Amino acid sequence: TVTITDLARENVRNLTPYQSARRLGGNGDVWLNANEYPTAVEFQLTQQTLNRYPECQPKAVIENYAQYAGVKPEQVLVSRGADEGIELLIRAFCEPGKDAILYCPPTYGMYSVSAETIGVECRTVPTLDNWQLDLQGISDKLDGVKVVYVCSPNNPTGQLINPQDFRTLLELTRGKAIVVADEAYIEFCPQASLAGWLAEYPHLAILRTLSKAFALAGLRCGFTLANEEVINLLMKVIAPYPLSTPVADIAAQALSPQGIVAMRERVAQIIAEREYLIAALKEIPCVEQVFDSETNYILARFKASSAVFKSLWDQGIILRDQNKQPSLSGCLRITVGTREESQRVIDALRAEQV
């Protein structure tokens, strides 16, 4: 007798699906756990052509994004969020059971999830104490590695990776592996993007998204920026129609010049609010340390983090626990929402302090 489960691939039977969920519908009122823009930006459909298939790579979207990012349109690929971008890279360059990817914890969990689901070895090299790259460590473990992911600014720690070190990492991987800079949060520190580096690195790829600064996580729309050769290789493994018409429709609107202007005003907003929360947190008794941030979230180390986490959780204030992340013992990640929401966190944290 054979069960359906016995027919499933070994790795599929043993893996643990990504822990993104942690809901409590109608239970909590303050959501600061997913790094989402705190307020809804409305968009209405303009293309009533739903009976016809869309273009594999909607032209308006690709062009509007290329324009915004300062790259050529043939250097842009649009997918169902950065999540799909992460997948495509592995799908195109990593031979299952032979090649490996490499990332440096503590960082985003999707790199690992995709490789493990697909069947590609996950090589890890923890970042240093300040979360910068352990360059020497990476140099000793590139054998068999085809793709290297590096998040900058990094989630959940918040800091930018030393560009000087990216230079080094790019040199170590030249002719050996693709380096993928996850710039999910680059909108908050646009001047640190590596997008202008494409002309000197044929193996550099960049992940972008509309789920954060752009306040359109609901659209599940993201992009990959890379040289022609890389984009075309990725186009060979992508689904024929990855983007729905309604998403292409509104994404193109969100990327219009006026759209870009509003996105930037949302950024200035979050940055000013972030600096407020950062200043206040450091003064709260139960707060041991607040780490610098170039994003829309703050990592802080608390006294009895689990107790604090649970207390605020029961009060409708949902944060993201980082307690099990390597080196982040006692840390919680706080998303930057509105002034009201930041005040809720502050007032709740002040109620602890034992």
Q: Distance of alpha carbon 188 from its chain centroid, rounded?
A: 13
Token pair in block for residue 130: 């300040």
Q: How far apart are CA 224 and CA 282, in angstroms?
A: 37
**Taking Cα atoms as reference points, which of 178, 18, 203 lies closest to residue 99?**
178
Cis peptide before 163 (omega within 30 of 0): no
In angstroms, what is the C-alpha Rg of the chain?
Answer: 21
Sole binder of ligand PLP in the list 64, 152, 159, 209 (CB under 6 A): 209
Stretch of 9-17, 24-32, 167-175, 211-219 contacting ligand PLP, by CB under 6 A: 211-219
Residue 29 or 292: the one with the smaller Cβ distance to its own copies is 29
Return the one option of ligand PLP, its own copies, none that residue 261 interacts with (CB less than 5 to 8 A, by type): none
Residue 333 or 344: the one with the smaller Cβ distance to ligand PLP is 333
Sole binder of its own copies in the list 28, 43, 253, 294 (CB under 8 A): 43
**What is the CB neighbour count within 10 angstroms for residue 6?**
8
Answer for the pair 217, 211: CB distance below 8 angstroms, yes or no: yes
Contact call for residue 184 and ligand PLP (CB under 6 A): yes
Stretch of 18-26, 139-147, 208-216, 251-259 contacting ligand PLP, by CB under 6 A: 208-216
**Taking Cα atoms as reference points, which of 138, 106, 136, 108 lies closest to residue 123?**
138
Exposed/middle/buried for residue 133 (C-beta within 10 Å: 0-12, 13-18, 19+): buried
- Which 15-54 positions form the footprint of ligand PLP (CB under 6 A)? 35
Exposed/middle/buried for residue 322 (C-beta within 10 Å: 0-12, 13-18, 19+): buried
Minimum gap (Å) between residue 157 Cβ and ligand PLP: 11
- Which 190-229 positions form the footprint of its own copies (CB under 8 A)? 202-203, 211, 215-221, 227, 229
H or E segment and range at residue 290: strand 287-290
Contact call for residue 24 and its own copies (CB under 8 A): no
Answer for the pair 35, 155: CB distance below 8 angstroms, yes or no: yes
Sole binder of ligand PLP in the list 57, 64, 114, 155 (CB under 6 A): 155
Stretch of 100-108, 133-141, 173-181, 295-303 contacting its own copies, by CB under 8 A: 173-181
Sole binder of its own copies in the list 117, 139, 162, 269 (CB under 8 A): 117
Sole binder of its own copies in the list 62, 71, 189, 230 (CB under 8 A): 230
Residue 184 or 334: the one with the smaller Cβ distance to ligand PLP is 184
Residues in contact with ligand PLP by CB under 6 A are: 35, 81-83, 108, 151, 155, 182, 184, 209, 211-212, 217, 222
